[PDB]
Structure formats: structure tokens, C-alpha cells
Amino acid sequence: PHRYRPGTVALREIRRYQKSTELLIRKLPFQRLVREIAQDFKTDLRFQSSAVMALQEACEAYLVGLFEDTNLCAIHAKRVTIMPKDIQLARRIRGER
Amino acid sequence: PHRYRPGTVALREIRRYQKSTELLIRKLPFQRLVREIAQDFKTDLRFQSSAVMALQEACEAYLVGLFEDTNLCAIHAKRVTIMPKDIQLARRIRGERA
Amino acid sequence: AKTRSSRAGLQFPVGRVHRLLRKGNYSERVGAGAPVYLAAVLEYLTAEILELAGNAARDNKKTRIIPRHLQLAIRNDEELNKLLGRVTIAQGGVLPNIQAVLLPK
Amino acid sequence: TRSSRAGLQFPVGRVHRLLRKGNYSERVGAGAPVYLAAVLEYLTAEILELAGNAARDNKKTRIIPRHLQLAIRNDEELNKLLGRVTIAQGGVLPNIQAVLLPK
Amino acid sequence: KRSRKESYSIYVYKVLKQVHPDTGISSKAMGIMNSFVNDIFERIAGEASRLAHYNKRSTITSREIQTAVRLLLPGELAKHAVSEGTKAVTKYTSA
Amino acid sequence: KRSRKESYSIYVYKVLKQVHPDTGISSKAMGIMNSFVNDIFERIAGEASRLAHYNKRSTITSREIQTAVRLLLPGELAKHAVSEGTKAVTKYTSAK
Amino acid sequence: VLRDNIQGITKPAIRRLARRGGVKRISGLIYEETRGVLKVFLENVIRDAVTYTEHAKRKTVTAMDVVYALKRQGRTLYGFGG
Amino acid sequence: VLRDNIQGITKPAIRRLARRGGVKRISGLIYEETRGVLKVFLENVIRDAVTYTEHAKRKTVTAMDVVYALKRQGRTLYGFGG
DNA sequence: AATCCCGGTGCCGAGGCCGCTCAATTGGTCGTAGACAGCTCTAGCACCGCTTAAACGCACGTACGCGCTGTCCCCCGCGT
DNA sequence: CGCGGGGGACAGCGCGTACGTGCGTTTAAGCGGTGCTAGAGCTGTCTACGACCAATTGAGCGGCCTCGGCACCGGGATTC
């Protein structure tokens, strides 16, 4: 029936998620990842629910800002698509490596 | 006569200047630049020689490292030549540029 | 005028700031003017952010400042954005900014 | 002296003095300066080993700042600890990007 | 009867009512403002501590806070903050 | 007259003689080690100061210095430094 | 047992994070790369949060442990204490 | 009077710095771009150093003022009094 | 088509008051950090000229930037 | 999760030129030697300013309830 050209809904999603502040990772998969990573550090650990929310607020903010630098790396190479080489350039310059 | 292919002495200079540690900017031009910039903040100022040396050590290390990131940006664009766009991308990622 | 805040013409507590300065191991001795100066500076910066955040709330047809209004205010003001450059505002989001080369021609 | 009782070359008394003089807390435990002076001695340690090796690799018998820079920037963990540190008269590591080499 | 947890909420409400008498603030927004005040508190106080240590002073006076504001705040923000602080100290000293 | 400024110069020499008895050091390189020791001192002491405040304690004990080393130092450097710390503390209390 | 949990960070979830960052087109290799990045990030922060938690002689990681850890890495977080 | 001193940071001086940075080929517009960046770097550093000197009530900027300013900006320098 | 602005509804957190308490304020003593004037002695500035290594400027062409094209498939859109 | 096709990635090529290289010309950096005094650093006295202790007082917090700003939405307005 109707079909948007590729890039139209992507731009539409950029404006949508730059308007809101909600977390974009589903809470249960993220919490299971936190408990597993922490379990490989120390067994039998309990988490305040706010401690998981604090870890998710920072991680999403870190990845959002990282995707910003990643997007700039792609555009510098006259590209529109971000690639793993763009992330690694950003983290290298950031001093993260 | 005799002529090396373009890029050969550039590499000889890279190997040379990555082997040494002496400063690469002439000391007196750098010193006069420091005094001019400082005057625009406070008039009638004197500088310790070690303070200017500290400023030159820091600035050149900053510039050398910035040229490393700049070189990575040019290589990222399938290029061998560094360009102002590479510096602006590097500083943008560094958080210095907005 | 019994309070040190009224004595300084401030809304911020001079007494509490003087306490925190002593119970903070910043120096052996804390002058009498130091808490007053700091509480006023804290008050000025507070007013500067709430001014821009109340404006952002009004632009969004809102009477309450929510965290996004603080984020819009700080990241749109050059000096506020620099003062909080290494700061993360919870539930603040980002500024709408799409790069030019991504726009359709 | 407290350094000998702990088996250290670094001064335990000076470290205890600086810990109280520096407004870090009300009180400083008796073990804190010993522990801290041993860690300081161990890191001072770790740099002097790798910097003395660099001096020998460069046919020197005396450590100059470049030897300290070579030691730190070639060691992964020392380079991370001093990631935001500039070593005066240290220079850089010789490293030319590959695409710049003639083929 | 839960534990006393101090905050800057009452003063943020007061300043907000001076600048926006009909405007409000949510829980999360108040938590960020509380974290903002604590952050800038620690930044200024930390710089003041270093200044006193650099000059072998046992005292942090309003002069240390002033220079800390100059090193920490950007241009216009420091300018107004310096005047609003000196204004409060002058009043406090006389009365 | 004269003025007195302290530095770790004598202890770095004593430590240098351990790994490299046949190798010396310049004054510039000596000033870098002095900056290095001071900088690492500040970073551990500052981290230990926050540890005590976080847990509402007025004392910085070896346990605070131990935790500060594990937050600051990376992996193997930290394991090694904890070994030094605990060893020297044991030898010190066993020589009261 | 718990295993492979990093896959809980799904492809559409990484997509939404890229959109808020202003990303239009995403390569296929980004998703596994982003998982490695997030894991390194979580490892560095949780390591410090647990180190604080252990020093406090607790078995529960508090939000203050995370906030103190985020401030350690230079990624200060507002709205959860401190 | 003193005027145009930034040009004293010459083209071959910038070239040597780029060589030590591992750069093989340098655009012509690089040299003026590098002069603006170095100016901002020195501006931010010297501004903080002068603020330290003023607080010490001195007319001579010490290397410690420079060291303290570099540490402020997250560019710590060893070998000058750190 | 998809998204927006509008008028109605609805509920729970703001923003306010109640009253208790503990942090601030007040009045006061003691001593010391540091202000201040005095003094000396380092190093920072100035200036000059003999030397020459470095910088400047131009000429030449080589190989790299980038603009074009062409293909092939890797993401975007969309219904279930 | 799959389906289907569209445009972006990428590779190949070719043109146009900018930048590397070399030499001759030109400029001022570096050297070390001398002279001058400003300003740092050391020094020496007096005292004002802050800690420190005790006793009184209200500023500030938790606990409290009611109330309205706004999250929610179903319909109509608009803008790509």
C-alpha cells in the first residue's frame, strides 16, 4: 500500500527520542545483565532497585553521548552510516581505548 | 642532481623527531607569544623562565598528541593528508570543540 | 534581624554553610565572611538556573520544572553548559540536533 | 625509626605527618602511613626498574626524563595510571602510521 | 520514623518563588538541583582548600572562596557571582 | 642564608640502588619522580578521605588505604601494591 | 546459573539509543560492538561500586555506591543522592 | 608594543610537531588552524595560572602556577615541581 | 498519512501548615597565624656582537585529494 | 521474525592539483659575556582573628493533609 523512503522513519525516530527522557533499554534484561556482571565479581549480592536504576541512567547516557561522537566520526569520513571503526576512533580519542 | 620520492624525507623526519625529546618550537618566539597573551589578562607581568618552559612543554605535548588524533581522522577518511576538518573532528570528540 | 541570612540579604542559609565549611576539613579556620559569600554565590547560580528552567517549562506549556527543563536550560546556555560539562542530568535527555549531511536533499 | 620496623626505605614518619597536615580526616590510624609509604615505595619502585632498563637499552648508566617516559608509556598499566600526566623532556614513542609508509 | 536526610529543597523552593512565583518543581528535578548545589559546593570548597594549602594558610576566608569562584566559573557567571558574594559579605560585616 | 624544601630525592635514590645499583638519575628525572610520588600520594589520600566520609568514619586506617589502592590502581599493579601494604603493616606491628 | 545475559540488550534497544544520539543508519556489526562497549563500561563502574560496598561491610550495593563510583570515573550523576 | 606574535609559531615548527605526531602529509590550511588551537590552549592555561599568581599577590608567574593550572585542566605535568 | 493542539477529565504528588528539636546564635576567653615593615640577596631583565643554524621563498613535478561512476547488498520499511 | 526492494557502502578509475622536495637566498636564533636592579625569600616584631567552651534560642526537618498542576486521553486541527 504505502511505503516511506528509507531514512524517513529514522529521522522521525531521532526527533521522537530526542524529545523524551525515558530509558530506552528494557528494565528486566538490563537488571539481569547487572546481576550477572556483579556476580562474576562477588557472589550473593543484593541490589537496591535504585542502584540498578542509577546504573541504567548512567549507561544509557554514556552510550547516547558515545553515539553522538560516533556519529561525528562517520560524517567526518563523508559517511552517513556509523561503523565499529567510528566507535573505536571516538573511544581512542576520549582516552578510553 | 638527486631527488627522493615525495614522502621519503617526511618519514625520515618522523623517525627522527619521534626518537628525540627536545622542544620543536623556537623558544623566543614562543616566549613573546606567551607575554602577549598574558598581557590581555593582566598588564605589567613578569615570567619565571621555568614557567615559560612549563608552558612550552605542555603546549607541544598537547600539539603532538592532537596531531596523532588528527592523523587518525585523516586515515579514517582514506586519506594520507591531515586537514583542518581532521583537527576539528578531533577537538569535537575530545570535548574541547562544541 | 536575628538570622545571618537576613543580615546579608540572602535567601540561602549562612549558618548552615558556615557549619558545612567547618565540618568539611577544608582548613583549620573559616572566616566569618566566607559562608556569606558562598551562600550568595550559591543563591545567584540557583536563580540563574531556575530563571532559564522556568522559561523552558513555560515554553513547554508547563507550570512545573521537570528535569528536562533543567537540561534544556543548562545545555542551551553556553556558560551553564560549561559549568556542568562533566555532569549528567537524570531524565534530562539531549538537545534536538540532527547533522546536516543526514538531511534528505 | 618506623621505616625499619616496617622494612621500608620510604619514611613512615614523614608520611604520617603529611597525612595529618593535609586535612584528609580527623585522625590517621597507625597502619595508614605504613601502608601508604609501602605503596609509594612500590610504585617509585616499578618506575625505576623499567626506567633503568630503558637507560641500559639506550646505552646509558643514568636515568634521564626520556627513560622515565619510555618506561611509563611502554608499560600498559603505568601508562594508564599517568594517562593525564605529561613527563617533561620525555618526548613520545616512535610510531609511524602504516599508510604513511612507502609501498 | 525514618532518618533525617538533609537537603537544599526548602531554599530552592524559595529562590524559585522569587524568580517564578507560580512555577513548580518535580521530585527528580529537585534531586538534580540538590546534586547541583552539592557539586558546586564541593568544587568551590575544594579549590579554596587547595589555595590555602598552596599559600601555607590554615584559614579559608571569603578571599579564598572568591578566587575559587574566579578559577571555577566561566566569565560572566563568575563576574555576577563575585559581586553577589562581596555584596553579602559587606552587609554581614557591618550588621 | 638558606631555605629548606623537602623532597623524596633520597628515598628514590635508595630505591633506585635496589633494582639498578649500577645506574643513576638526572636532576630533571629526579623532579619527575618527585612529582609522581606527590601526585600518587594525593590521589590515594584523597580517595581514602572520601571513603571515610562516605561511611561516616573520622579515621583513615590501613583498610581505607587498601580500598583506595584497589579503586585507583589497575588490576595487577593493585594486587602487587596490596601485597606491599599488608606485608609492611604486618612487619611493622610485629616489631612494635 | 546465568549466562549470555548481554544479549538481553537487544537490537531494537541499541537502535533506540542510537536514534536519541541522532544516528540515521546503523551497520549490522554495531550491535555486538555496542554490547562489548556497554559491558566494559558496566565492568569498570560496578567494580568500583562493589569496592565501596565491601569497604562499608555491606552485602547490598546502594545507589550511593554507584553514584560515588560514577563520580570516580568522571561521569557524575545527578538525581540519586550525593 | 607586541603584535602578530602567533605567527612566530612558524610553518616548519608546526611541521616538526606533526612529524613527531606521525603525520606524513599536511594540508596548507593546517598551519593557521594550528595557530588558533594553540592560542586557545595557552589562553585557557595562562588564564588560570595568572589567577593563581594574583591570589598569591605576586607579579611573577611561577612554574608552580603553571603546574597548578595544567592540573586544573586535566593535563598534569611532571618535572617542574609537581 | 502521520502528527499535532484542543477540550474534557482525573488523580496523585506538590506545596503548605503543624509542631518539635537540634543546629545556629550569642557572649566570651586564649593564642596564634599572618599582617607588616625591615633587610638582603637571588635571578630576571637588558643589551650587544660574533656565529650560523634555521627560516624564508621560489621552482618543479609527483603522487595524492576528490569527483565520477558503477555495481552489489546491506539496512530500512512494513505487515504479522 | 521475516519479506522485499531501495540506496548506501565500497571498489575502480581518472583528472586535477596541491604539497613534498631541493637550492639558493635571507633572516634571527643561539651563544656566553657583561652589566643593573627588581623582586623574591628570608627575617623579626605585635596583635588581630579564629578556635574553643558553654548556655540560650529559633531555623530547619519530618510528618502531616489537601489540593491543583498535569499525566491521560479521544476527538479535530494541521502539515508534511
From Swiss-Prot, chain A:
Cystine bridges: none
GO cellular component: extracellular exosome; extracellular region; membrane; nucleoplasm; nucleosome; nucleus; protein-containing complex
Gene Ontology MF terms in the entry: cadherin binding; DNA binding; protein heterodimerization activity; structural constituent of chromatin
Disease the record associates with this protein: Glioma: Gliomas are benign or malignant central nervous system neoplasms derived from glial cells. They comprise astrocytomas and glioblastoma multiforme that are derived from astrocytes, oligodendrogliomas derived from oligodendrocytes and ependymomas derived from ependymocytes.
Location in the cell: Nucleus; Chromosome
PTM sites of type Phosphothreonine: T43, T70
Residue numbers of N6-(beta-hydroxybutyryl)lysine PTMs: K19, K42, K85
Span covered, complete protein: 39 to 135 of 136
Biological process according to GO: chromatin organization; epigenetic regulation of gene expression; gene expression; nucleosome assembly; telomere organization
Modified residues (N6,N6,N6-trimethyllysine): K19, K42
Broad class of the protein's primary localization: nucleus
PTM-bearing positions, type Phosphotyrosine: Y4
Post-translational modification: Acetylation is generally linked to gene activation. Acetylation at Lys-85 (H3K122ac) by EP300/p300 plays a central role in chromatin structure: localizes at the surface of the histone octamer and stimulates transcription, possibly by promoting nucleosome instability.
Protein family membership: Belongs to the histone H3 family.
Modified residues (N6-succinyllysine): K19, K42, K85
Record has Nucleotide-binding as a keyword: no
Sites of N6-glutaryllysine modification: K19, K42, K78, K85
Protein name according to UniProt: Histone H3.1
Keywords: Acetylation, ADP-ribosylation, Chromosome, Citrullination, Disease variant, DNA-binding, Hydroxylation, Lipoprotein, Methylation, Nucleosome core, Nucleus, Phosphoprotein, Ubl conjugation
Modified residues (N6-crotonyllysine): K19
Domain of life according to the entry: Eukaryota
Gene field: H3C1
Curated annotation (Swiss-Prot), chain B:
Modified residues (N6-methyllysine): K19, K27, K42, K85
Residues with PTM N6,N6-dimethyllysine: K42
Modified residues (N6-(2-hydroxyisobutyryl)lysine): K19, K27, K42, K85
Sequence positions bearing Phosphotyrosine: Y4
PTM description: Acetylation is generally linked to gene activation. Acetylation at Lys-85 (H3K122ac) by EP300/p300 plays a central role in chromatin structure: localizes at the surface of the histone octamer and stimulates transcription, possibly by promoting nucleosome instability. H3R2me2a is present at the 3' of genes regardless of their transcription state and is enriched on inactive promoters, while it is absent on active promoters.
Location of N6-(beta-hydroxybutyryl)lysine modifications: K19, K42, K85
Modification type N6-succinyllysine: residues: K19, K42, K85
Modified residues (N6-acetyllysine): K19, K42, K78, K85
Keywords assigned by UniProt, alphabetized: Acetylation, ADP-ribosylation, Chromosome, Citrullination, Disease variant, DNA-binding, Hydroxylation, Lipoprotein, Methylation, Nucleosome core, Nucleus, Phosphoprotein, Ubl conjugation
Official protein name in the record: Histone H3.1
Species this protein is from: Homo sapiens
Curated annotation (Swiss-Prot), chain C:
Residue(s) carrying N6-(2-hydroxyisobutyryl)lysine: K23, K61, K62, K82, K105
GO cellular component terms listed in the entry, alphabetical order: CENP-A containing nucleosome; extracellular exosome; nucleosome; nucleus
Listed GO MF terms: DNA binding; protein heterodimerization activity; structural constituent of chromatin
Modification type N6-succinyllysine: residues: K82
Cleavable signal peptide: none
Record PTM: It is involved in the initiation of both imprinted and random X inactivation. Ubiquitinated H2A is enriched in inactive X chromosome chromatin. Ubiquitination of H2A functions downstream of methylation of 'Lys-27' of histone H3 (H3K27me). H2AK119Ub by RNF2/RING2 can also be induced by ultraviolet and may be involved in DNA repair. Glutamine methylation at Gln-91 (H2AQ104me) by FBL is specifically dedicated to polymerase I. It is present at 35S ribosomal DNA locus and impairs binding of the FACT complex.
Keyword tags: Acetylation, Chromosome, Citrullination, DNA-binding, Hydroxylation, Isopeptide bond, Methylation, Nucleosome core, Nucleus, Phosphoprotein, Ubl conjugation
Residue list for modification N5-methylglutamine: Q91
PTM-bearing positions, type N6-glutaryllysine: K82, K105
Compartments, as annotated in UniProt: Nucleus; Chromosome
UniProt modified residues of type N6-(beta-hydroxybutyryl)lysine: K23, K82, K105
Summary of subunit composition and partner proteins: The nucleosome is a histone octamer containing two molecules each of H2A, H2B, H3 and H4 assembled in one H3-H4 heterotetramer and two H2A-H2B heterodimers. The octamer wraps approximately 147 bp of DNA.
Protein name: Histone H2A type 1-B/E
Portion held of the full protein: 15 to 119 of 130
Swiss-Prot record, chains G, H:
Keyword Oxidoreductase attributed: no
Outcome recorded upon mutating K71E: In TEBIVANED2; results in severe early developmental defects when expressed in zebrafish embryos
UniProt-reported outcome of changing P12R: In TEBIVANED3; results in early developmental defects when expressed in zebrafish embryos
Record PTM N6-propionyllysine, positions in chain: K11, K24, K57, K59, K71
Taxonomy, superkingdom: Eukaryota
Residues the record lists as Phosphotyrosine modifications: Y31, Y68
Keyword Repressor: no
Main subcellular localisation: nucleus
Post-translational modification N6-lactoyllysine, affected residues: K11, K57, K71
Sites of N6-butyryllysine modification: K11, K24, K57, K59, K71
Compartments (UniProt record): Nucleus; Chromosome
Residue(s) carrying N6-(beta-hydroxybutyryl)lysine: K11, K57, K71
Modification sites for Phosphoserine: S27
PTM description: Acetylated as part of spermatogenesis progression prior to histone-to-protamine exchange.
Modification sites for Phosphothreonine: T60
Residues bearing the modification N6-(2-hydroxyisobutyryl)lysine: K11, K24, K39, K57, K59, K71
N6-acetyllysine sites (modified residues): K11, K71
Gene Ontology biological process: chromatin organization; negative regulation of megakaryocyte differentiation; nucleosome assembly; protein localization to CENP-A containing chromatin; telomere organization
Residues where N6-succinyllysine is found: K11, K57, K59, K71
Modified residues (N6-glutaryllysine): K11, K39, K57, K59, K71
Effect of substituting R25C: In TEBIVANED3
Family: Belongs to the histone H4 family.
Function comment: Core component of nucleosome. Nucleosomes wrap and compact DNA into chromatin, limiting DNA accessibility to the cellular machineries which require DNA as a template. Histones thereby play a central role in transcription regulation, DNA repair, DNA replication and chromosomal stability. DNA accessibility is regulated via a complex set of post-translational modifications of histones, also called histone code, and nucleosome remodeling.
Protein name, as recorded: Histone H4
Native species: Homo sapiens (Human)
Upper lineage: Eukaryota, Metazoa, Chordata, Craniata, Vertebrata
Portion of the parent chain present: 22 to 103 of 103
